[PDB]
Design a binder for this molecule. Structure first.
Ligand SMILES: NC(=S)N/N=C/c1ccc(O)cc1O
Ligand SMILES: [Cl-]
Ligand SMILES: [Cl-]
Ligand SMILES: [Cl-]
Ligand SMILES: [Cl-]
Ligand SMILES: [Cl-]
Ligand SMILES: [Zn+2]
Length: 315
């Protein structure tokens, strides 16, 4: 006897596609690679309990290609399988609310993802891909499994791999609307004179080399092409935040002078991030763990500051 069930296939979990499947054949033989809420069911034959359920598939016809691109804003052929593989793990993580924010209980080297997620909830940022819009909304509400899996897929990191917070933020910023953001810098060399530069989008909100927004406004020393040392300072800034980053170093964080920051303890090959947020006092969120202090010193690698419009007085 021939036995079938009805299931739906999807690439975006919104647009469904009716299918009839043969219970004597695997999903793989019928759809190609197939997933059920992250689980790889490619080598599995249909079960009775599968009737009416939704399965993710790869974009193997033009309708799915268009639906996948519109939702994710990527055409990397291994994206969906990387997203499903991550999701099968992130759906098992825990997402406690810590001081009003969605955090992540430590697992699988995910400390960099927790600090990133905590940071996002403290800065003004809108994502462009619908997939990230929808999953970030759920994450803010507490159900961050899809959002975390998407970050991993977009950053090309697997669960368990050690991640860098600045790189992760660069990827997310690439998929956000920062088109309004503008930065003007000036560089002064005693032998070469001056040169001004204007930066836009992601490059207007990120800086690598110093943690201090004030020192960026006063000036910082960088090499020049003659061998001289030149000074770079911030001429104009238009953005709702800025991110200052540097190799980890002992640094003092003062209440009320920054929004939030990342601390990294360890070495190049492995280590651990924690998150510091400046509220009524200084809170350190380490996954599910929370402590407080009136002052803070530690190896800081990123600091986030509020902004709207700044213009220098330097002449
Ligand atoms: N190539 C064309 S026209 N669209 N494909 C979209 C697409 C493909 C693979 C994938 O994993 C995610 C996607 O958004
Ligand atoms: Cl896991
Ligand atoms: Cl927990
Ligand atoms: Cl959004
Ligand atoms: Cl204070
Ligand atoms: Cl600030
Ligand atoms: Zn020079």
């Amino acid at each position: 006897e021939v036995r079938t069930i009805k299931v739906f296939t999807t690439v975006d979990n919104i647009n469904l596609h009716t299918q009839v499947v043969d219970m004597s054949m695997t999903y793989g033989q019928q759809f190609g690679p197939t997933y059920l809420d992250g689980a790889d069911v490619t080598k599995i034959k249909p079960h009775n309990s599968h009737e009416g359920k939704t399965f993710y598939v790869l974009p193997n016809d033009d309708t799915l290609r268009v639906e996948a691109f519109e939702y994710y804003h990527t055409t990397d052929p291994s994206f969906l399988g990387r997203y499903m593989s991550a999701l099968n793990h992130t759906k098992k993580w825990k997402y406690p609310q810590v001081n009003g924010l969605t955090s992540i209980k430590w697992a699988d080297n995910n400390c960099y993802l927790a600090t990133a997620l905590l940071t996002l909830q403290q800065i003004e940022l809108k994502f462009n891909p619908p997939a990230l819009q929808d999953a970030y909304y759920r994450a803010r509400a507490g159900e961050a499994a899809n959002f975390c899996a998407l970050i991993l897929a977009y950053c090309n990191k697997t669960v368990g791999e050690l991640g860098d917070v600045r790189e992760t933020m660069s990827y997310l910023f690439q998929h956000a609307n920062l088109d309004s953001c503008k930065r003007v810098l000036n560089v002064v060399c005693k032998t070469c004179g001056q040169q001004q530069t204007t930066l836009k989008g992601v490059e207007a909100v990120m800086y690598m080399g110093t943690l201090s927004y004030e020192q960026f406004k006063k000036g910082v020393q960088i090499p020049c092409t003659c061998g001289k040392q030149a000074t770079k300072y911030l001429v104009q800034q238009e953005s709702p935040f800025v991110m200052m980053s540097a190799p980890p170093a002992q640094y003092e964080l003062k209440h009320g002078t920054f929004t939030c920051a990342s601390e990294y303890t360890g070495n190049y090959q492995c280590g651990h991030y924690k998150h510091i947020t400046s509220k009524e006092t200084l809170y350190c969120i380490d996954g599910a763990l929370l402590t407080k202090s009136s002052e803070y010193k530690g190896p800081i690698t990123d600091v986030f500051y509020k902004e709207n419009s700044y213009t220098t007085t330097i002449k």
